[model samples]
Target: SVPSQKTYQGSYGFRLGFLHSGTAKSVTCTYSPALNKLFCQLAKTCPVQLWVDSTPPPGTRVRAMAIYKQSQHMTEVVRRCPHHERCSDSDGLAPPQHLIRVEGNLRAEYLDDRNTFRHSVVVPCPEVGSDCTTIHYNYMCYSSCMGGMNRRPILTIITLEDSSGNLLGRDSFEVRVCACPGRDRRTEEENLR
Candidate 1:
């Protein structure tokens, strides 16, 4: 049966579910690149908050990646959009007929920062999945913290443990964020001013 097609009206407190290894879970996550805030909501069934805690928010001049994988060493695809892009096809179709497909969302915000001007970064987004391979995955990062704390390394959460020690589900992907050197200086200063 063909599902009814209607315009998507953005709603609040919406969530999706993922199940793995006989365990089921619901997740609602959002990333605003402009505001540099990553918000996540798991079904009340969740025992723990097992979510992300960005030390410097987003757009704090650093390198980072949001990962989803079966194991730490096994990553499928990686993206380089700090302010993520909600990858959606206009026709709303997928590939491989029955392959696991993933899409990420991105929201951007601007602010007055101590670093002269405001910067932007990517955060977590709603993930989708289907039938395929791999399990037990998580998200990680690599960024520069204060005091020259260099975090330019890879990170991953391959365990299927939720915030409350319950098994939820898992998938794998690579979300890489690289800084644009030209962005260091204001665009106006470089070209116009």
Candidate 2:
């Protein structure tokens, strides 16, 4: 029989269950299809969660309470925008699918002396089976006149942690802000004069 499709409203929290080993644990266990692990002792019954686009393909044993046809996932390889002029915001752009470039592991925040800017970094999901992903950060360039004459390169530190909240790795990156274009500078100076 074909399963009827309908808008599934409300949470299916009570229906999901899991069994681990020989024990019949009927409670829900955190399952990550990406990590392929169970956070708890294992499910006595099948525990369903918001994962995957549809039911598992033939011969697969994956199930979910709120099965989705679309998922929020990404690849390990990262790429930058090809045309700098097309960049409207600082988030940059994504590369073509054929591109297989891995742009390092950590992405640090923009340099700010006062540290008034709030920077967001991507962290691994706490769940066992969740696939790795990145979060986007939005920031605008600081006012050119605000920077001091030193123009020293800004140092930013980034850190990644494990599911247990332990420090997995830490690295530092330098942010070098280039001087504004000569024409723009002259315009600003003329305006002030």
Candidate 3:
């Protein structure tokens, strides 16, 4: 017996029909007679993976849906010039560039926990020579049980997508927060003397 098509979960969602560049026009699926195993085609000359459910005769062309994951909405942030301005000077110093902007919604998922988190914020650009606003976000995870548990910092993944729901790239970063020490109480003249 032979199967017309098979279903598989897509790590990154992908589209059907037209090929997404690179090589082949469509994904091909076939079975091997020598090894008697299922083979799936990814591109014109690339056929990988073993199909278990059905065993099609050698060279039997099977329809395969090659799909991958993608990001729905994404945006980009850019810095013009003048990092930060100095308050003392009349003209002031230029402000530095920090995290420009967050394109899409940032969501965090935990393996053991059932709850998920999402966050988004918008900051306006600074005046011509004034200081720029700093983009900041905090994330943390914890677990409580009879016996204490040791948990490491959760790995955060961020994905950038194009206007169309296609993934552009991915990024990973760590976030740590701590309060700064108080400023000096001594006066300028006293310190100088």
State which candidate has the highest lDDT.
2
User: What overall lDDT goes with each candidate model?
Assistant: 0.23, 0.25, 0.21
Residue 109, model 2: lDDT of 22
RMSD of 3: 25.4
Positional deviation of 188 in candidate 1, in angstroms?
29
lDDT of 1: 0.23
Tell me the TM-score of each prediction against the true structure: 0.18, 0.23, 0.21
Name the best candidate (by TM-score).
2
What is the full ranking by TM-score, best candidate first?
2, 3, 1
Q: What is the lDDT of candidate 2?
A: 0.25
lDDT of 3 by residue, 110-170 (tens): 1111232122222121235632222222211111111111111111233323333233333
| Count of clashes, each model | 19, 13, 14
lDDT of 2 by residue, 1-193 (tens): 1111222322211112122322123322233222222322210122222222223223222111111111221111111123322344332331221111112324322221133222223322214675322222211221121322122222223333334423333333222222222233234335656
Better of 2 and 3 by TM-score: 2
Ranking of all candidate structures by their lDDT, best first: 2, 1, 3
